Amino acid sequence: VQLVESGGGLVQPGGSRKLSCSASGFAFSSFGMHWVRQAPEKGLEWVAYISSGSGTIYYADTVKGRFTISRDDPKNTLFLQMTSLRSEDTAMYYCVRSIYYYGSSPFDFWGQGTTLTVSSDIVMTQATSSVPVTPGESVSISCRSSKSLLHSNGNTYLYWFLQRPGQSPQLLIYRMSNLASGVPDRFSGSGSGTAFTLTISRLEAEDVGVYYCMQHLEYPLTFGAGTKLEL
Amino acid sequence: ASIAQARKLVEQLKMEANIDRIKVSKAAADLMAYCEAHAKEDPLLTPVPASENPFREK
Amino acid sequence: LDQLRQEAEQLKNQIRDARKACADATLSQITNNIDPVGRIQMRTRRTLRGHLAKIYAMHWGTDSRLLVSASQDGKLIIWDSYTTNKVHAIPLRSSWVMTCAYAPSGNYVACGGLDNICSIYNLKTREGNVRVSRELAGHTGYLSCCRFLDDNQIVTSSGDTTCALWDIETGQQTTTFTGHTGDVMSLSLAPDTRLFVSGACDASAKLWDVREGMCRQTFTGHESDINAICFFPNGNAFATGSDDATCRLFDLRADQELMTYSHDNIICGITSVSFSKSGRLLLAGYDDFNCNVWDALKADRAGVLAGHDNRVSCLGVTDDGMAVATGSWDSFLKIWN
Amino acid sequence: YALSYCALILAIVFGNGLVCMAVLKERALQTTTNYLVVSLAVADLLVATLVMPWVVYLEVTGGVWNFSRICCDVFVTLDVMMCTASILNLCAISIDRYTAVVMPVHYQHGTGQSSCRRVALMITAVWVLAFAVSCPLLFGFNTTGDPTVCSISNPDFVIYSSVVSFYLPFGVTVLVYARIYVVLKQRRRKRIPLREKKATQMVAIVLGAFIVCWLPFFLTHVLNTHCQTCHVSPELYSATTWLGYVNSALNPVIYTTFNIEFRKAFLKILSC
Amino acid sequence: TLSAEDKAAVERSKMIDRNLREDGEKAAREVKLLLLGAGESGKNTIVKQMKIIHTTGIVETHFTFKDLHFKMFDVGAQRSERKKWIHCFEGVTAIIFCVALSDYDLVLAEMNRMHASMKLFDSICNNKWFTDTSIILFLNKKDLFEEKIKKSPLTICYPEYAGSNTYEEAAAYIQCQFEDLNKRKDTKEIYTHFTCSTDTKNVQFVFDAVTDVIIKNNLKDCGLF
Ligand SMILES: CCCN[C@H]1CCc2nc(N)sc2C1
């Protein structure tokens, strides 16, 4: 399972660029795709989503209409026709897998991404930005949402993502305390309605990074400010 | 093959014969006790209200 | 040879005499002193559609929400009973599937049929698609039933009159069960997984040991081949179904029939049998296109689940007992509550 | 008397409703081929509900029309469109049987995208053709004299409507059934029981019923309108109209009572 | 009321339903036929020749002739209680039966091979699950029958036989005896053919029989016949 995005570099505001992502090692046809931007020293932000078979497409309010996205199942390649550019469009773009079915774990795999430089919605906030702590000691991270994420079905649409330095975000917990595959049992999630917290039994040198809290109750997807752990 | 089959059969029967034996009434009483013990938590025997039933109108 | 045959006959007579001597009382006489259950009314809640062939087998999940059904079109479908949405569609290499199983953990599923091979599929592949993990070849007859003991080993039944326990990682059967004079039709696992029983065309049910690989106990009394078998929720008893239009309840300890469920007007065979969570009610499928609910402690009919347009082949009750699902040859699966 | 018309309406409604409910209930009857029979039954039900009661009113009043001209125009349009739809449905059933005989590989089991698509196309074409044929009446094209008489008497419209409604579908059906007969006989001869004779009898009786029901009515319809000197009388016109209306009453019997599955369904329904 | 994830799951279920419908439509256009007979009856030769023209378990053979797909199922190797799985073949378009014509004077460990073949044909034809399923009979060893009949009289297999020992009379008697086992001739019919080293005519005969069966089934569906 590997994703390799293509395109980037310097592009004038009045120009246009087309980004391409190559999907291999998995059934790209049955997996939905997402695009997430990350400006320098800024948090994540959802861009667009395509369901399996290209039957459904969504765009963010700040990108709606301007940006065109296409899918090519036979070639297992995803394209982003980026028609117009402004100064704020400068950010790193990441391709994220997503499959929706009972027991599924969407946003499990995140691509390496590419760096591109240019010459109502539920509010997600995190009070703590930096939490210095020594290795071994337990660490807790709290996130809050402006609207209750508990749907009538009995499950809360909350996600936790960890982005290590020089590495793309990695899924940790999904809806809303289940451990993602391949993650150590140290991480644990809890909450009720609107208050949620992420706890670590014991911190290790590999836990250094920034933790993002994301909601998937309704589009557009919103990402938290992000809490950084350092020693 | 007849000799071997008859042998295996006779050892099987001999082994099955030597088994502890209890009364049928005790087994029936135990079954009734088990049925009545868990009768209060059987949705099929005692239908639950719509507040808890997960199969309802979509 | 003659001496051995006479010894076998004497042993059989002694076993019969020992069984008879302890038949001091019957279940019906003791149970006559309790109030019977009222008319059971069940209304279909979901009607699963998508199968274009006969439904032969189905198994309820441990979570009591997901279930898998097998059809003759070579497709295995995992249904979300709460929403009826299809979770997975597994194309079988052989369309002649006769049984299916769902792992307790839900990671893997099993199926088999006339191909004499049991195929294991992985539902949690990093690839994202369901693919066959291991193939259990070695049986000389069509697979009749299969059940998952644990993530590591699976027990399967075949038409060659023998049952075997297969190690998925090794791929070679570790234990072989022999002694059935007829083809083995069904399997059932005890709640503790310590013991399992199998039914064969010889109208006898045998008790087998998982590790010892020997037949501890044998049951007889059916007038025809046994097609269905299921353990009592307590785990100390089980019921069997045959083509003679009668269901017989056998308890492991008494080694004799406790009660008989039959009705004069029924002349058709019985396909599948299942128990309620508490064991108070007995559900059996019949070839007359409807399922009948039987009073376990009194043998009185409690209700009828009609609506199927063809033979009812398989049925099962959820782990929590919330609802019961029934399969039929008309390609439609219904959930009752 | 009008009581005969009332009895005919009762028989029509009873038969068509029974057939429709039997098709709806018994699972095996839900097939592409039976959709044409269902459409024919629906058309018969519409005829029963809409046109004959007003004809009975006219018979009681002896042809005196007191309602507005709009009501007469609507009555004429409805009657014409129902009749054309029924005739075209019969033609569609014949052509479906022909397709089954000549191209059986896809027709097998009467299920699939190919069968459903063609059945829907034929039904839609039949209904659209009937509506198009009957629309000019609504536009006041049916020129009439004394307003108290409600009937169709325009030479220009009558000949074209009769042609399109009967003669083209009638000739098509006759040719199709002759071709089917030839095909079966040739197949039997190439291969070299009572079942083939039964099929031949079915085809022959269907064709004879269609002829004796519709051909005389349209022939009288054209002769009275275009003959400069013919011995036509109102009694003959009424007799032909009744003979054409009883066609709808007798259609469900011939088309369902002789089919094994339909017979079983009817017996099961009547057993209750 | 459904959430975004629930809507995505619904869309995935609809896509799966569409895929299943497409697969069923594709599969409904293939003719499915069952092949039965003894190992020495010529089943292997028939399968080999048809495959050329175009381990335990059941053998699946696919061949095409005149833009028509055929699916053949072989259950000879599956020796077991056949009535416990014969019902799986209710939808079989036709049944192919192969019997060796020269096995009348041989013995099998019924005692005679031909008597056993006739008993098997009677059992299969009268099976309750094959009420409207046509049967095709193939005679594979007529060339050896030519030589064998001239030396070994046919009276050994049929004591009641009293006709001439000539080849044509014997073949007609065998065909009539095989056909007489049918009890439901009105509902179903038997197609008989003679097979030899030549294989061109066998496929044409099979295609013609399949086409006739399909035509009759469609006539039944339309109500005729
Ligand atoms: C027996 C029913 C009497 N109405 C007929 C009168 C004139 C006419 N013209 C057509 N093209 S159909 C039709 C129906």
Distance, in Å, from the CA atom of E29 to the CA atom of E2, rounded to the nearest integer, reads 38
Question: C226, C203 in Cβ contact below 8 A?
Answer: yes
Chains A and E are touching, with contact defined as 3 or more CB–CB pairs separated by less than 8 Å: yes
Q: What is the DSSP letter of A100?
A: -
| H/E stretch holding A51 | none
Q: Using CB atoms within 10 A of its CB, is residue D172 exposed (0-12), middle (13-18) or buried (19+)?
A: middle
Pick from A119, A139, A155: which residue ends a domain?
A: A119
Identify whether A176 is preceded by a cis peptide bond (ω within 30 of 0): yes
CB contact under 8 A, A216 and E8: no
Q: Could you say which of B12, B19, B43 has the minimum Cβ distance to residue C322?
A: B43
Closest C-alpha to ligand 1, atom 1: D241
Q: How many CB atoms lie within 10 A of CB D103?
A: 11
Q: Which of C46, C63, C69 is nearest to C318 (CA)?
A: C63
Q: Report the residue of chain B nearest C17, measured CA to CA.
A: B17
What residue ranges in C190-280 does DSSP mark as E strands?
195-200, 204-209, 215-220, 226-231, 237-242, 246-251, 256-262, 270-275
Give the SS3 label for residue E223: coil
Give the SS3 label for residue E13: helix
Q: Using CB atoms within 10 A of its CB, is residue D64 exposed (0-12), middle (13-18) or buried (19+)?
A: exposed
* Torsion on CA atoms C189, C195, C196, C197, rounded to nearest 10: -140
Distance, in Å, from the CA atom of C207 to the CA atom of C188, rounded to the nearest integer, reads 10
Question: Domain span at residue A196?
Answer: 120-225
Neighbours of chain B (3+ CB pairs under 8 A): C
Q: Measured between alpha carbons, how far is residue C199 from residues B33, C218, C291, C330, E204 in Å?
A: 28, 10, 21, 26, 47
Question: C200, C219 in Cβ contact below 8 A?
Answer: no
**Are A36 and A96 in the same domain?**
yes
- Which residue, chain included where needed, has tokens 């409207």? E132
Chain C CB contacts of E86 below 8 Å: none
CB contact under 8 A, C159 and E57: no
CA distance D138 to chain E (A): 38
- Which residue, chain included where needed, has tokens 């059986």? D104
Residues composing chain C: 337
Count of domains forming chain A: 2
Strand order across the C324-328 sheet = C44-48, C333-336, C324-328, C312-317
**Are A23 and A101 in the same domain?**
yes
CB contact under 8 A, C1 and B2: yes
| CA E10 centroid distance within chain | 44
Q: Report the residue of chain E nearest C72, measured CA to CA.
A: E88
**Are A196 and A132 in the same domain?**
yes
Of C49, C80, C86, C185, which to mutate for an interface test with E (greatest number of E Cβ within 10 Å)?
C86
Specify if A205 maps to a domain.
yes
Q: Which atom of ligand 1 sits closest to the CA of residue D79?
A: 4
Question: B42, C278 in Cβ contact below 8 A?
Answer: yes
Amino acid at site B25 = S
Q: Which atom of ligand 1 sits closest to the CA of residue D133?
A: 11
- Which residue, chain included where needed, has tokens 């995803």? A78
| H/E stretch holding A38 | strand A32-38
Specify if A231 maps to a domain.
no
Q: Does residue C84 belong to the interface with chain A, where contact is any CB pair within 8 Å?
A: no
Of A102, A151, A155, which to mutate for an interface test with C (greatest number of C Cβ within 10 Å)?
A102
Q: Ligand 1: list residues with CB < 6 Å.
A: D 79-80, 83-84, 152, 161-162, 165, 221, 241, 244-245
Q: How many CB atoms lie within 10 A of CB A119?
A: 11
Distance, in Å, from the CA atom of C135 to the CA atom of E48, rounded to the nearest integer, reads 28
Binding residues of D: 79, 217, 221
Chain C CB contacts of B23 below 8 Å: 22, 24-25
Phi, psi (rounded to 5 degrees) for C194:
-75, -35
Question: D51, D36 in Cβ contact below 8 A?
Answer: no
As beta bridge partners, residue C66 has: C80
Residues composing chain A: 231
Distance, in Å, from the CA atom of D132 to the CA atom of D145, rounded to the nearest integer, reads 25
**Are A50 and A144 in the same domain?**
no
**Count of helices and strands (H, E) across chain E:** 6, 6
Phi, psi (rounded to 5 degrees) for D259:
-100, 135
- Reading the block at residue D149, the tokens are 């008489």
User: Pairing state of beta strands A227-229 and A178-179?
Assistant: unpaired
**Are A103 and A135 in the same domain?**
no
Chains B and C are touching, with contact defined as 3 or more CB–CB pairs separated by less than 8 Å: yes
Write the secondary structure of A110-160 as one string of H (helix), E (strand) and C (coil): ECCCEEEEECCCCCEECCCCECCCCCCCCEEEEEEECCCCECCCCCECEEE
Closest C-alpha to ligand 1, atom 5: D80
Q: Could you say which of C25, C256, C320 has the minimum Cβ distance to residue B25?
A: C25
First to last CA, chain A: 33
Q: Measured between alpha carbons, how far is residue E193 from residues C55, E53, E139, E172 in Å?
A: 37, 18, 6, 12
Instruction: Tell which one of D80, D215, D242 to mutate to probe ligand 1, the residue whose CB is within 8 A of the most ligand atoms.
Output: D80
Chains B and D are touching, with contact defined as 3 or more CB–CB pairs separated by less than 8 Å: no
Question: b/e string for E51-69 if b means 16 or more Cβ within 10 A?
Answer: eeeeeebbbebebeeeeee
Binding residues of D for eticlopride: 79, 217, 221
Phi, psi (rounded to 5 degrees) for A138:
-70, 145
Q: Which of C208, C105, C233 is nearest to C156 (CA)?
A: C208
- Reading the block at residue A141, the tokens are 């991270």
Q: Does residue B50 belong to the interface with chain C, where contact is any CB pair within 8 Å?
A: no
**Are A216 and A124 in the same domain?**
yes
Question: D179, D98 in Cβ contact below 8 A?
Answer: yes
**Are A82 and A141 in the same domain?**
no
Question: b/e string for A184-207 if b means 16 or more Cβ within 10 A?
Answer: eeebebebeeeebebebeebeeeb
Chain C CB contacts of A25 below 8 Å: 127
Q: Which atom of ligand 1 sits closest to the CA of residue D158?
A: 9
Pick from A119, A135, A151: which residue ends a domain?
A: A119
Pick from A119, A146, A165: which residue ends a domain?
A: A119
Specify if A186 maps to a domain.
yes
Specify if A230 maps to a domain.
no
Contacts 24+ apart (CB under 8 A), D63-69: D63/D149, D64/D148, D65/D147, D65/D148, D65/D149, D65/D150, D66/D148, D69/D147
CATH superfamily label, C1-336: YVTN repeat-like/Quinoprotein amine dehydrogenase (2.130.10.10)
Of A24, A76, A101, which to mutate for an interface test with C (greatest number of C Cβ within 10 Å)?
A101
| CA D231 centroid distance within chain | 28
